[PDB]
Amino acid sequence: YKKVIEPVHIKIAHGSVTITNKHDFITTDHLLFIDKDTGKTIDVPSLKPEESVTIPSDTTYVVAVLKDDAGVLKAGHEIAWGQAELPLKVPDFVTETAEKAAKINDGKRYVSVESSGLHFILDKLLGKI
Amino acid sequence: SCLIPENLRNPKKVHENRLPTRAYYYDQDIFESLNGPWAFALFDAPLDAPDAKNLDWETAKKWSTISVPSHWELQEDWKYGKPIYTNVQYPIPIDIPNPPTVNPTGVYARTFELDSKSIESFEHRLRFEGVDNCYELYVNGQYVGFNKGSRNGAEFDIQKYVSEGENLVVVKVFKWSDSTYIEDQDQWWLSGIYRDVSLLKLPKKAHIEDVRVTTTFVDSQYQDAELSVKVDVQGSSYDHINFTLYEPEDGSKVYDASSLLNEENGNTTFSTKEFISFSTKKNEETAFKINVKAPEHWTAENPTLYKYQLDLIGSDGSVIQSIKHHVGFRQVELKDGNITVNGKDILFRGVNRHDHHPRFGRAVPLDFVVRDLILMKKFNINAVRNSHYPNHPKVYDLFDKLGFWVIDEADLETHGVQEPFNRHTNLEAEYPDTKNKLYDVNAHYLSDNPEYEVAYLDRASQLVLRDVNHPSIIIWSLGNEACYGRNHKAMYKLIKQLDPTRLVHYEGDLNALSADIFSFMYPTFEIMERWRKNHTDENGKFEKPLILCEYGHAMGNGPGSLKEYQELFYKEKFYQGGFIWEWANHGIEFEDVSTADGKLHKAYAYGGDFKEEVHDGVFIMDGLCNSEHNPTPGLVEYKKVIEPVHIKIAHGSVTITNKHDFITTDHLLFIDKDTGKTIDVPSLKPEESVTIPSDTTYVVAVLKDDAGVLKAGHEIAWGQAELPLKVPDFVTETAEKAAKINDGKRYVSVESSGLHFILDKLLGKIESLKVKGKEISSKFEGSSITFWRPPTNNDEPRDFKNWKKYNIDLMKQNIHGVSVEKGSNGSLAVVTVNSRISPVVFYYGFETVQKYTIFANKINLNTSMKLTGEYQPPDFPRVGYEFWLGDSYESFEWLGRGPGESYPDKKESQRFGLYDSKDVEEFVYDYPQENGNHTDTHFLNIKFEGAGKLSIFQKEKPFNFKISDEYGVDEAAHACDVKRYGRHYLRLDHAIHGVGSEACGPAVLDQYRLKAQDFNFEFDLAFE
Amino acid sequence: SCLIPENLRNPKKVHENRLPTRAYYYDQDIFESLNGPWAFALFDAPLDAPDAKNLDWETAKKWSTISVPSHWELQEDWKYGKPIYTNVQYPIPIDIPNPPTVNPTGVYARTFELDSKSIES
Amino acid sequence: ESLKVKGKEISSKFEGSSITFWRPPTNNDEPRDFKNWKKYNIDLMKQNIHGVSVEKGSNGSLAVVTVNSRISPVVFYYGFETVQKYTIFANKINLNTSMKLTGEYQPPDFPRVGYEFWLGDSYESFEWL
Ligand SMILES: OC[C@H]1O[C@@H](O)[C@H](O)[C@@H](O)[C@H]1O
Ligand SMILES: [Mg+2]
Ligand SMILES: [Mn+2]
Ligand code: NA
Ligand code: NA
Ligand code: NA
Ligand code: NA
Ligand code: NA
């Protein structure tokens, strides 16, 4: 719920961060915007209700946080955030394809595959490892 | 050493400009609270902190806020560091009187508003109830003063510095100073303004500064009393004082958290039932003495109070100021070598209580202290020791109203001076009659150091003068573990000078050269007994009594042998009881990664968890209550041993002895639990007894009506007739049934109708036993009979070392021969297993014979174990079987001690009865260790879903059992670290080692030790 | 102690039918190596091991192989357990002269070919 | 904090004290010497500064910085009244170290005594006689 009702929208696409103030009355001036990829703050102009700004940036992840203690909230409290969409990258695991002899036993019920560092048994009756 | 400020390294600089200590009284009309959010910044050391003479509110305004009162090591996300636990060792280097140069400095700032009329009408003060370690105070950019003494209060005159409108308060707080050396209690190191801050507005022209109330009996017969009231009024513009004493409210008054904490006055009419009035006359002494006609005695068992109102009255006849408080008519004396209250030689049923809260630390809300005290009363406690410093001033009224004998203790421990000595000389043990010679050698650093005299005296002066009007305080204590020196004598002289009405305690002063009482901690009975005899003369007279200011160390599973201590207390007039160490574990709530789970869990921190350079580990976890301040089995056991009424049932009789000090048994309802009907018991005075003939087995003594903080029906005491071990009338099936017996190569099989028994001959292991739909099997790792338990805190220093050394956890069963024969006298088969049970690497072990006699519906298991070989261990943790319970397993029920756990030297609070596992909340230890054993078990029923029960009993002697799914307890640091199997097991034990208090105190007593010897025992496994 | 075989618990049973010790000399013409892969199976204790008086090559043939010479605690993937290091302490209980009843037993098997002339020569 | 002379930078490797005494225990250290050193908290030696004196150079030096401190581990009395005198030249820094052993309950020996410095990013190799 805290996320969907966040009073500031942060959108990251096409080398840009678009920040829209979605409060009813207050500006964004009390908030510190951090580029989470570098840890350094982004200088964001004071935005009124419904005003927005597009800032060009290489960032992936931006957080909007409280500058100082205010009300019952502490400095550093997270009001809003945004992320650029993360593409699914295939991890660079290296499959061992070297020619290693393997002992294969296709028994009555159980099938066995044994090699160096490997032991695989499947129950043919059940489809069970 | 100019890089460390002068005042932080000067033991004589105890304060600057602090007002003299006066008796504490809270007044809603005078006290304005300055608690709440304050601007705050932390600095590495004093030189990084701003000069407060130039700090604006506009500058400070911009800082983060912290809430006062609180410790700065206990903040959201550990923003300002973490707690540090040390017992003895100082967390700093010793270079008296220098603190480290790197010295965390917190600066606090807030504002408050002042009226035009306020400055005209009132003298303005600031009062700080407690700040750790010390601080300087500024108002409106101007230096007001300085203060030391972390658990003492302080007031400062603010009138000169105050302005109309906005006023600025700045407090510079330092973590270390010369004072650190005398504040080395076994507790968490925590800092900050951790107690209330208040703005006091006192009437300007004249006001009540101090009051002194004493009640002294005129007579040897403790009837008529002199009430003395001395008032110190400040200023000229007053006429006289009025005093009104009201009719008493009996100590049996009902209280709750709400009425105890109610702070309302002003327009609330205090009381009406006038008993005595008195007026001073113009220009005369503002003090008086009046004779009071046979007043109601104040006692811890009956805390009867007379409310009073004291009015300062002007020339026009109006009330300038009022004090509303209470008088407790009581007198403490050292009389014929005993501590005596109202002519009576009392017994301490006591406990040591630190200020501790699992989230707030030493910043304990009053609500929570009330919670503590109610709980104490509910568990038969009558005395509290303020280990080792005064509490929040508002707590002492709670003692007055609820009724506790209180030892109020100076904030002074010097223990750390000993640590290098302990290590340099490889010191292993300290003993109460002998140990003071070890402290003597290092006394010169602090307690015998003339530079510290002013500080030691100040701790004394501050202790007494703030709390001097509370009838519940009967003893002042000079501190704890600060060796013995000239400064202690100086403290003693001052206290007797300031308050002649009470006695002085100091355990470090072995021979009581400057104390009125003898005091031991954790002594053996031998040591108690020698002391008695050396201080009892030929006549049978003694000059001073002995108390145990600390005994029965309550760390983890324990303490053992509270019974034997109590027997000693009642037997000799020389012993006046003691105080358990301690009330509660000092655990701090935090988030721990689980060893069982790989996930984050709520847990309670001790040393090491906050990653301290140096720490003392689990030694902070030594309470009768857990970190969350709830009763452990330790407290349950304590309530029983200290019960103030004895109920003995033997020979068709109930003998009832009143063991209170003052009150009768009249408020108690005695119930015959076998019939539910009450027993008419005559009114018994202290030490009186009556024998009543009855057929009863079980008698309970219970409260007739709500009284104090206890409810009608609350159990004070109980007694049972001893229960003989009856063989259950289970019917063994001995009918001739053919049985299929297969004695294979490795496995032996016995099959019959409703029965399947498989034994692995190679291991001595029951692969499976399935009788009438119910299944068990051996829980086997090395041996079918195991000896190990997860070491308790008490086991750790010695017994565990021995058991580990002798490889008791690595016991192996080596099978020699298995014999299989057809049944004879109704049995289906006899399987006999011959083996040696012995750990790897050792000679010692048991020539073992396990005979399984198998019936259709029962299995008889006869175990013979014969101890053989050189180099044996002294004792074992336990000896018994471990069985996996089948998937069907659902609950258990037993005849024996309950509802909770019991151990040989910690069992008598668990009365005999039939108990159901479902009715019991299993106790979770904060530090995982041996738990959940049930001793003196007559029989055990284990229920299987839709298959009836398995009944288990031992021949001729009751047994021990545990049923759980837990493992990895040894390695588990916290409750969340405990691993759990996918099924339950039964730990079925012939015997189990006692529990003791050896973490700090005597070893498990000889008659409770499971000594190395032969074992012979027979079990029946009877299937429904 | 009949669940542990007599010869494993008899200090005097140093050997049975071993030839007397003689000075060692390697000779290529006399020594034929039997090193290489051998059929092998591990058992918990002697009583689980097969009676060798009835063990065929056809039966043993089907087992996994281990290479001789080698330790069985030093195999691919620790197939047959791991090494144990003790200095002084015995890794077993002391009950001289008994070994533990649980006593890892490895059975090795292989074949070799013999000539008509070889047995004569 | 930093010493940068002619493009070369060093600084104190600091955890508690500028003069440290600890070494990773050898196998030979383990049974006794390590036990002693650990017992006496030699790994937790702290340097507590008392005074720092700063004066203009005299015989060709640029400045003289004198540090007065106690070097002592937590929880113990024993330590060294220490004087560290830095005489600073344009191309050289002379460091005079005086350490005076004081206090009751002293350890028998130390693993070592000396300074620890971080080498600057430029660092590439070393050479010694
Ligand atoms: O649990 C250990 C306890 O030992 C006592 O000697 C001491 O007075 C307590 O403050 C506490 O340290
Ligand atoms: Mg202590
Ligand atoms: Mn944990
Ligand atoms: Na401490
Ligand atoms: Na007594
Ligand atoms: Na403790
Ligand atoms: Na544990
Ligand atoms: Na060895």
* Hetero compounds: beta-D-galactopyranose, magnesium ion, manganese (II) ion, sodium ion
Text of the CATH class of one domain in chain A: Mainly Beta
Oligomer: part of a larger assembly
Reported by name, the CATH topology of one domain in chain A is Immunoglobulin-like
C-alpha end-to-end distance of chain A: 42 Å
Could you name the CATH homologous superfamily of one domain in chain A?
Immunoglobulins
Rg of chain A, alpha carbons: 27 Å
Sheet with most strands: strand arrangement of chain A: 4-3-6-7
Which structural class do the helices and strands of chain A define? Answer: mainly beta
Number of helices of chain A: 0
**Number of β-strand runs of chain A:** 10
Strand content bin of chain A:
35-45%
* Topology of chain A as a string of helices (H) and strands (E): EEEEEEEEEE
Give the biggest sheet of chain A. 4 strands, antiparallel
The helical percent of chain A reads under 10%
Indicate the CATH architecture of one domain in chain A. Answer: Sandwich
Overall morphology of chain A: elongated
Largest interface: B-D, 23 and 22 residues
Protein name (chain D): Beta-galactosidase
Organism (chain D): Kluyveromyces lactis (strain ATCC 8585 / CBS 2359 / DSM 70799 / NBRC 1267 / NRRL Y-1140 / WM37)
Family (chain D): Belongs to the glycosyl hydrolase 2 family.
Could you characterize what this model shows?
This is part of a larger assembly, with four copies of chain A. The first copy, chain A, has 129 residues and is mainly beta. Chain A has a domain at 6-94: Immunoglobulin-like, CATH 2.60.40. Helix content of chain A is 0%, strand content 40%. In chain A, strands 4-3-6-7 form a four-stranded antiparallel sheet, with no helix packed on it. The interface between B and D is medium-sized, with 23 and 22 residues. Beta-D-galactopyranose (GAL) is lined by residues 87, 186, 480-481, 521, 550, 553, 581, 619, 622, 1000 of chain B. Chain D: This is Beta-galactosidase. Chain D: Belongs to the glycosyl hydrolase 2 family.
